């Protein structure tokens, strides 16, 4: 059991790089022993969960880590009743602040809510009501992707801590450090393409590098294993699709669509990469608008559960209509 | 010490405001001993629990409030075991106290199922002369019409800011914090017509920074700024597609915005922008579709691009009409 996204979490708050302002404010809040307000938010892979776990480890220590820290996934537990019963069951246990090592521990238990922005308004209203139920003995920490998804009352009893996305130089630095630590043979171009396919995510990059070490088995990691583990459709397929739609008939469209489907490539990856291609190139505003609206409708239909081949042939019909006119 | 709502909770029929017809009718019924089963429904934080607690402390003393009033709330699961459990056994009993009816305050009565509301309909119709229920709820339409047909309903609406600002002025005169005009405008706009969130936001602004202005409220709450949404709409209406997409995705990853909040603030903005009717219909249909597509849980960049797409078709049509 080697979870590299958990193994390479900095357990010390001084080991947290790039966020020393938030580290210093967290250290002041821990030493002040009166912390009613706490919130972490940012893009995934920024290590807000690792930062609050490092704060919990530097305050509670390893002995109280399994006692006064409770982590719950909000997206896994979107039901009302489970987060009513588990939070109350954890909060009702009266554990004093006395530590066997003699360190002064202030008397609160910490609660982590991972992906708390996935809740609805009524779920967060019931959550707030539970916060007002147990605002004394235990303390809470919400982790969300966007702070504007969180309803107002939960922003009243918390202090925000914004996270910048990590710059690609320190992303490549951390990836080469981890590859040197675990003796992983991968070139600089492989690291750059690995951070390209995982757009601003160190969790996805760490899991993809772990899977590359699993699938290569000691070999040098190439571009093919990276572009196949992430499921990335190669740019030759997208260029062939746009060549068929630009100058061709529906026989060519059905040929390239059947080739993509029988190659096993997912339609979600195709709509994402076709959106990425069509939002940057030199088409007209009307053509880009019609194609992107069709891509959004296609991804909605794929989320509903509609058949992918019919959606792809309708999407390629729309792209052919816009391009071949 | 304590939160301001738990400090300054109203305890008198005159201390609750904007419900003067409702409070007058409740006082008229309770002076003549003709009070029916009550169903107070409305938005959160508009004075539903505190009104019936003021009426209970008018009816009963401090000593017999804990005996002839049973309170059930969100901590109690509302299924079919409760209605055949403590509330039936509470309603079907007499008391050694003065000869008056009992009282059951059932918070969040809209979360009961149709079978649970029918069983509660049986309990309500069986015992009337000794028990007067009080069901308080957010949505009237989530309960059955039989339950609406046996208990008298009362609509606890929102508080108009014209009537909301004297209580805010009273709590800013009693508690000395810095008060400006734009801070009060931000309070009465972001609070959305309920006193509970206004007092919570005011206390959080006092405890976090110390002064109450517009930008302090916006930074403490995280609400999207008006100039922020103005910049988003300007980028959608007079920039290129790749330029607008890159600018808005950098603003989303910087400011911490989300596309649902961008959607509702842009929806509030486009009814100020004097569009022609046809492109207004097109924008509203497209934005409602984007809201539903975000509700069903898809990728976010593609829906952002569809929003920019609708506004680019809009800007082409606007310039072509000019």
């Amino acid at each position: 059991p080697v979870p590299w996204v958990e193994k390479y979490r900095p357990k010390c708050v001084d080991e947290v790089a790039f966020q020393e302002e938030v580290v210093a404010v967290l250290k002041k809040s821990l030493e002040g022993a009166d912390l009613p307000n706490l919130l972490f938010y940012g893009p995934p892979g920024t290590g807000k969960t690792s930062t609050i776990l490092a704060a919990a480890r530097e305050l509670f220590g390893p002995e109280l880590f399994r006692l006064r820290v409770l982590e719950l996934n909000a997206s896994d537990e979107r039901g009302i009743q489970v987060v009513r019963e588990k939070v109350k069951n954890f909060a009702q246990l009266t554990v004093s602040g006395s530590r066997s090592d003699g360190k002064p521990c202030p008397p609160f238990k910490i609660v982590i809510l991972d992906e708390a922005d996935s809740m609805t308004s009524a779920a967060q209203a019931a959550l707030r009501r539970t916060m007002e139920k147990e605002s004394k003995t235990t303390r809470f920490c919400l982790i969300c992707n966007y702070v504007s998804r969180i309803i107002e009352p939960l922003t009243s009893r918390c202090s925000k801590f914004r996270f910048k996305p990590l710059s690609d130089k320190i992303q490549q630095q951390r990836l080469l450090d981890i590859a040197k630590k675990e003796n992983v043979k991968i070139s600089d171009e492989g690291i750059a393409y690995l951070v390209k396919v995982s757009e601003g995510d160190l969790r996805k990059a760490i899991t993809f590098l772990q899977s590359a070490t699993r699938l290569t088995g000691g070999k040098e990691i190439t571009e093919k294993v990276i572009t196949d583990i992430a499921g990335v459709i190669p740019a030759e397929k997208i260029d062939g699709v746009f060549a068929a739609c630009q100058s061709g008939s529906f026989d060519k469209l059905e040929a390239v669509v059947k080739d993509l489907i029988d190659e096993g490539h997912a339609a979600t990856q195709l709509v994402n990469q076709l959106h990425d291609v069509v939002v940057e190139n030199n088409l007209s505003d009307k053509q880009k608008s019609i194609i992107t609206e069709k891509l959004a409708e296609v991804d909605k239909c794929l989320a509903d559960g509609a058949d992918e081949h019919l959606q792809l042939i309708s999407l390629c019909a729309t792209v052919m209509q816009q391009l071949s006119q | 010490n304590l939160p301001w709502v738990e400090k300054y909770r109203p305890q008198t029929l005159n201390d609750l405001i904007s419900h003067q017809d409702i409070l007058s009718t409740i006082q008229k019924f309770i002076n003549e001993d003709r009070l029916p089963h009550l169903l107070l429904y409305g938005p959160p934080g508009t004075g539903k629990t505190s009104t019936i607690l003021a009426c209970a402390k008018q009816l009963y003393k401090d000593k017999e409030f804990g005996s002839m009033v049973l309170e059930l709330n969100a901590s109690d699961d509302r299924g079919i075991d409760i209605i055949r459990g403590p509330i039936l056994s509470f309603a079907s009993t007499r008391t050694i106290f003065k000869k008056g009816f009992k009282l059951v305050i059932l918070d969040e009565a809209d979360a009961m199922t149709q079978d649970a509301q029918n069983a509660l309909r049986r309990v309500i119709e069986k015992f009337t002369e000794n028990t007067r229920f009080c069901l308080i709820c957010n949505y009237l339409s989530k309960i059955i019409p039989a339950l609406q047909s046996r208990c008298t309903r009362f609509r606890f609406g929102p508080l108009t800011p014209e009537l909301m600002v004297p209580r805010l002025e009273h709590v800013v005169e009693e508690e000395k914090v810095d008060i400006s005009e734009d801070g009060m405008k931000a309070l009465v706009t972001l609070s959305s017509g309920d006193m509970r969130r206004a007092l919570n936001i005011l206390q959080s602004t006092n405890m976090a920074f110390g002064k109450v202005t517009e930008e302090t409220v916006y930074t403490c709450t995280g609400h999207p700024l008006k100039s922020d949404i103005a910049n988003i709409l300007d980028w959608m209406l007079n920039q290129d597609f790749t330029t607008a997409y890159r600018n808005i995705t950098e603003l989303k990853t910087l400011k911490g915005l989300a596309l649902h909040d961008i959607l509702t603030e842009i929806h509030l903005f486009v009814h100020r922008v004097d569009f022609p009717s046809s492109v207004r219909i097109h924008l509203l249909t497209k934005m409602a579709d984007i809201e539903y597509r975000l509700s069903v849980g898809t990728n976010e960049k593609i829906q952002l691009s569809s929003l920019i797409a609708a506004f680019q078709v809009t800007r082409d049509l606007i310039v072509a009409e000019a």
Binding site: - | L233, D234, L237, N238, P276, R315, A322
Partner: peptide
């Protein structure tokens, strides 16, 4: 009527261009 090429000088406005850039404006009132 709802689209004005000249700026309104007594109310707020929002600019709106196209691929050619004629720079129309829309009333915020």
């Amino acid at each position: 009527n709802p689209v004005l090429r000249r700026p309104p000088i007594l109310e707020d406005y929002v600019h709106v261009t196209s691929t050619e850039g004629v720079r129309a404006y829309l009333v915020l009132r």
